[PDB]
Design a binder for this molecule. Structure first.
Ligand SMILES: CN1CCC(c2ccc(Nc3cc(-c4ccnc(-n5ncc6cc(C(C)(C)C)cc(F)c6c5=O)c4CO)nn(C)c3=O)nc2)CC1
Length: 264
């Protein structure tokens, strides 16, 4: 599973993530890769090293494939699939694209296909948002950095009160009881569907992070986005039932998105 660090070639800076510097490279001088350079004291290295075994066995076309690790060095490196068009949230905000609703529906299907794969593997993402989704050269949308939230050492991210915590993508049982489940990832999907049809708009945009958690409890749910059909909104709304047991599964939601495009 270990990748040779000298087998990698740094070519361009892909930005900053939770674990620092991310770069574009090439493995063996032919195959494209993304290199996450883990910043000192940002990750639970020990726990991540052991769990990378299970993460590598997860192979779905709409999931950002972890090719391997460089663990016999400081900083340690994570080699993943390269997505040319970058972050889905940034891609949704670029007005130039001038997306059809059929394209936004296709984006949802790409995230849902990946999530049903993760559900069938009893694997939680734990931070499903557009910011953690990527876009390749073919415009194919893929689920990224799934489960890596467990190894984040950063205090502002781990705490439900913190400035980095995914408050807006979180259901009431998470914000209140720290009750993470399949249904907490299910709530996040409805928020991601909203981000897509809202074209990268921030959920609960008018509100502050503190004011978001208060309204979410009172039963305030996201409105119907301008680009969303009545049938498409019924799908994102079904993810936000107060009783987690009443929310559907990624399997059902997948069937839901596919019936909607056959009737688009
Ligand atoms: C003008 N152009 C210039 C190039 C630009 C561009 C930007 C980019 C591009 N590709 C990629 C860019 C990246 C990439 C770059 C920077 N930061 C992150 N990032 N973000 C969030 C994140 C969250 C977590 C938790 C635990 C869940 C909280 C953990 C993480 F480790 C991260 C993390 O690393 C990523 C995603 O891997 N990756 N991968 C595969 C890419 O393929 N490709 C092109 C697009 C605009």
């Amino acid at each position: 599973w270990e990748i040779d660090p000298k087998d990698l070639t740094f070519l361009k800076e892909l930005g900053t993530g939770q674990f620092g510097v991310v770069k574009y490279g090439k493995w063996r001088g032919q195959y494209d890769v993304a290199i996450k350079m883990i910043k000192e004291g940002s990750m639970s290295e020990d726990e991540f090293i052991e769990e990378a075994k299970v993460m590598m066995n997860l192979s779905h076309e709409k999931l950002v494939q972890l090719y391997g690790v460089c663990t016999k060095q400081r900083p340690i490196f994570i080699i993943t699939e390269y997505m040319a068009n970058g972050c889905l949230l940034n891609y949704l905000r670029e007005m130039r694209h001038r997306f059809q609703t059929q394209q936004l529906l296709e984006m949802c299907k790409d995230v849902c296909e990946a999530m049903e794969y993760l559900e069938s593997k009893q694997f939680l993402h734990r931070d499903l948002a557009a910011r953690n989704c990527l876009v390749n050269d073919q415009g194919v949308v893929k689920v990224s950095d799934f489960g890596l939230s467990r190894y984040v050492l950063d205090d502002e991210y781990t705490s439900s009160v913190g400035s980095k915590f995914p408050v807006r993508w979180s259901p009431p049982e998470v914000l209140m009881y720290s009750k993470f489940s399949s249904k907490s990832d299910i709530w996040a999907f409805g928020v991601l569907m909203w981000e897509i049809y809202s074209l990268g708009k921030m959920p609960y945009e008018r509100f502050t992070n503190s004011e978001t958690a208060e309204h979410i409890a009172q039963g305030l749910r996201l409105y119907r986005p301008h680009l969303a059909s009545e049938k498409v909104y019924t799908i994102m709304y079904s993810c936000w039932h107060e009783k987690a047991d009443e929310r559907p599964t990624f399997k059902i939601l997948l069937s839901n998105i596919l019936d909607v495009m056959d009737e688009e």
